[PDB]
Structure formats: C-alpha cells, structure tokens
C-alpha cells in the first residue's frame with residue numbers, strides 16, 4: 001500500500017521495526033474476546049478505537 | 051579468598067578456580083541430565099553451611115529463577131544402601147545378581 | 155540516669171522512648187558485609203554497640219525514627235569528627251551528634267545519630283536474597299511498615315508464591331520509589347566524597363532505607379578533588395533487587411514523576427543509544443567499567459555478559 | 463568493617479618518560495602487585511611534571527612493556543627535605559579499588575599536609 005511507502009520514507013535510515021508495520025498499515029483488525037465482560041470494554045457498539 | 055576473587059578482583063584467578071573445583075568435586079559429587087539431577091554430598095558440612103543444602107536451592111531459585119521450590123518435589127535420602135528415591139522417574143533397588151549386589 | 159535522654163534529644167524533637175533498658179546497649183540481629191582481614195561474608199552478625207531510642211509522633215504513638223548512639227573509641231571519635239566536618243554539607247548524609255557523657259568516672263564518647271530507620275538496606279537485601287518462608291518476619295515487618303501491604307494479607311497462606319498468587323509482584327513493586335531514592339542519594343554521596351578528597355569503601359549496610367549514610371569509621375583523607383568511592387560490593391549485591399521491585403518504573407513518566415502521563419516515544423525510533431547512556435550516567439556513575447550500549451563493540455565474552 | 467587494604471605491597475624505582483623512547487632510566491617510584499602470575503605495577507610517584515610513557519623489560523629480558531602514564535595527581539609531602547612537590551601517575555586503566563589501595567598505603571606511611 002502507499003501507507004507503507006509513507007511510513008518507510010519518513011524513517012531516518014529506511015529501517016523501521018517490524019511490530020509497527022501492521023500497527024499503522026493493516027486494513028483489517030481481528031479481536032478475540034473470551035467473555036462478555038471483556039467484550040463490553042473493547043468492542044462495544046458498532047465503532048471502537050484501537 | 052572466595053570473597054576476594056569474587057568482588058575485589060577483576061580478572062580470572064585460575065589457581066583459585068582450580069582449587070574451588072577440587073573442593074566441590076571432593077564434597078559435592080553430582081549427576082546431571084536435562085534438569086534431572088542427583089547430588090551426593092558430605093553431610094557433616096552441609097549441617098554447618100559449608101556446602102549447599104536443600105533450602106539454598108530454594109533461596110537461589112526464588113531470587114534468580116523467580117519460582118518457589120515447594121518442598122514436595124525435592125526429596126532427600128540418608129541410607130545410600132537404597133539409591134535415589136527417584137531419578138529419571140525410575141526407583142532404585144539393591145538386589146542379588148549372581149554373587150554380588152547390583153542396583154536396578 | 156535520665157539526663158542521658160535529655161542530652162541525646164539535644165535540640166530537635168525531644169519525644170524520646172528508651173528502646174533499651176537504661177543507658178546500656180541493645181543487642182540486635184542485623185545483616186553486615188564484613189571483610190576485615192580474618193573474615194568475609196554477607197551473614198547476620200550481632201550489634202555494633204548501639205543504644206537505640208524511638209521518637210514519639212504527636213498523639214504519643216510510635217513512629218519509625220531512631221537515635222542510635224554508639225560507644226566506640228576516642229581515636230575513632232576524633233577521626234569521625236573530622237570526616238563529618240568535611241562531609242556535612244551534602245544532603246545525603248544523616249546528621250550526627252558527637253558528645254561526651256560520663257557514666258561512672260570516664261567521659262566516654264558517644265556518636266548520637268539522628269532520625270534513622272529501624273532497618274537498613276542490607277536487611278532488605280539479605281532477607282529477600284536469603285528467603286526462607288519458615289521465618290520471614292523481617293520481610294513481613296519491612297513490607298507492612300512502608301504501606302506496601304497490610305497484615306491481613308499474610309493470612310492468605312501461599313502469599314509469597316509466584317506461580318499461584320501472581321499478585322505478590324504488585325506488593326513488591328510498591329517498594330520501588332524508596333530504592334530509587336537510595337540510588338540517587340548514593341550518587342550524590344559519591345560526588346561529595348570525591349569533591350572533599352576522601353578515600354572510602356561503600357557498603358549496603360551503611361544506608362537507612364530513606365537514603366542517608368552514616369558511620370565513616372574506616373575512612374582516610376587525601377587532597378581535595380581526588381577522592382575515590384569503592385562501589386563493587388554495594389551495587390553488585392544490590393543488582394538482583396531492581397527487577398523484583400521494578401526499581402526503574404518511574405522513568406517512563408513525562409518527568410520521572412509517579413503522578414504524570416507516560417512518555418509517548420515515536421513509533422519508528424529504535425536506536426535508544428543515548429537514553430541508555432544517560433540512565434547509566436545518572437544511576438551508575440562510578441561503575442568504573444566501560445558499558446557499551448551495543449554489544450557488537452564488546453571485547454570478549456565476559457564483557458558481553460557485563461553489558462547484556 | 464569493610465577495610466580497604468589489610469597489609470600492602472612493595473615499591474621499586476622504574477624507567478619512564480614522555481613518549482615511546484623518552485623513557486631514559488630510573489625516574490619513578492612504582493608500587494607493584496606481586497602476584498604469582500607475574501609482577502603488576504600499581505602506581506608511579508614522580509618528581510617530574512609531564513610523563514606519559516613508562517617502561518619495564520619483561521622478565522626474560524627479550525621483551526619490554528610500556529605503560530601509559532595518564533594525567534597526574536598533585537600533592538606535597540613532609541620529610542627532612544621539607545615540601546616534596548610530587549605527582550601521582552596511575553597506569554592508564556586503573557580500577558578504583560587499586561587507586562584506593564595505593565592512596566591508603568601512601569597516606570598511611572607517607573606524610574601529607
């Protein structure tokens with residue numbers, strides 16, 4: 001994607017850590033919730049922010 | 051000299067390393083596999099804290115490995131005529147084979 | 155008689171309670187770090203000739219602060235007098251009080267310390283490094299006194315365990331700030347000791363839990379600007395604690411204060427080579443051994459151990 | 463009790479100078495560590511102001527070792543001569559504990575003002 005270019009071109013060198021590429025570029029999130037209590041504090045409603 | 055070479059000094063003291071190794075192998079005979087150990091030690095020393103005991107491994111595991119050694123997984127025997135209470139999950143029995151006595 | 159108690163309190167806070175018997179010493183069981191010329195070790199010995207008095211807070215309840223007056227040697231008396239006179243202006247030095255009280259026919263000298271804490275740092279380090287649940291009363295007291303827990307926590311049997319009761323870390327971590335303060339004040343101590351021209355060897359049982367330092371009985375003098383502190387048992391014995399109690403947790407906050415948000419590092423910044431050196435220069439300044447932030451520059455395997 | 467130096471070691475005069483060949487002959491007073499794995503010089507007491515390179519021939523004579531005398535330490539002493547304006551040089555890369563032993567033994571047996 002173009003977001004990969006935007007995130008790499010702004011590195012001081014061009015080497016970005018691996019655990020931030022999906023964080024700031026992935027186009028789909030997958031949550032796994034064990035019980036309703038955790039569901040209420042994570043994915044309540046149609047929209048949520050992570 | 052152990053404290054001296056431990057904290058004061060900075061480089062190896064292979065004379066004293068050899069000395070300590072000799073002392074250990076003379077008073078702390080050992081048998082190892084991947085974490086399944088057996089230790090035969092002089093007892094009239096460990097009763098005075100001159101060598102390791104079974105509480106000392108508890109303390110070391112506590113402050114370094116960050117686990118508590120419950121005193122129901124580590125045993126201790128006192129009559130060598132019967133071998134280790136358990137090693138590699140096999141008990142040891144002293145029986146008569148032929149003319150002599152063997153451990154199976 | 156009783157005027158001894160009037161002399162000890164001196165000018166500050168005469169709410170004395172004798173914790174001994176009369177004017178006689180008080181035998182104890184503390185963890186030293188002796189190495190003179192005949193004995194080494196890190197074991198519990200017994201009393202340094204200390205008479206101890208406890209200060210009363212208002213409402214006549216007892217508070218953790220003591221006046222430990224020793225009774226050892228005139229030559230050591232003047233020796234300590236001179237070192238204290240040189241070393242006084244530092245904030246991390248606990249206020250001595252040298253006086254001369256008469257017992258029977260002898261102006262026996264005393265060193266009446268001021269506002270101490272019942273347990274030093276060597277006691278914490280020992281009783282946490284030589285753990286024994288059979289008798290961990292000292293750890294119990296040290297835990298309850300500094301508001302880390304309450305006595306009712308110690309009835310939940312298997313409280314010390316790490317596998318079960320994983321909450322015990324939250325009890326230990328609350329001892330964080332105190333240890334941090336010790337480190338900081340220790341650093342300042344070294345600075346003073348260097349700038350005054352003093353040769354001295356530092357130990358963990360020379361430090362109340364607040365951070366202060368005391369009893370420089372075995373020091374010597376040099377020319378100013380050319381002092382040396384010897385920190386090789388102190389730091390090294392203390393090392394296994396700063397990860398049990400998460401001693402550096404107060405370093406991801408915006409200004410290293412517990413009542414602030416977290417520092418938000420940039421997403422892509424990975425080097426963290428100057429931060430490590432700043433942390434080293436703040437906390438461990440007199441660890442006279444090169445610390446390479448990246449181990450690729452190490453010389454042999456032992457230096458790799460020392461930098462990892 | 464954590465005592466700095468319970469009994470100490472000895473001294474001999476040695477050769478030193480400014481640069482590599484500037485080491486002429488005996489111009490120093492060196493405390494040394496007599497270990498069974500060879501003698502390790504501890505400290506250099508000098509009456510010259512700027513030395514940087516000391517030298518001692520190895521025990522077999524074939525080789526000689528050089529020591530960088532890093533920046534000195536001013537002091538003055540009491541003697542029948544009176545004030546002795548001397549400088550303490552340590553071999554570059556001396557641990558704090560060895561500096562402690564050197565200075566402790568000096569101030570114990572050598573008079574300072």
Ligand SMILES: Nc1nc2c(ncn2[C@@H]2O[C@H](COP(=O)(O)OP(=O)(O)NP(=O)(O)O)[C@@H](O)[C@H]2O)c(=O)[nH]1
Nearest residue numbers: 184202204271272273274359360369370371372463
């Ligand atoms: N914190 C604390 N320590 C006490 C108390 N009573 C006795 N002590 C002991 O007294 C010690 C004071 O140090 P002390 O041995 O007198 O001096 P030092 O610096 O350790 N060594 P040196 O005697 O050579 O100067 C503490 O480390 C501790 O072990 C007390 O009520 N509180």
Ligand SMILES: [Mg+2]
Nearest residue numbers: 202224226371
């Ligand atoms: Mg004392």
Ligand SMILES: [Zn+2]
Nearest residue numbers: 446452457461
């Ligand atoms: Zn290194």
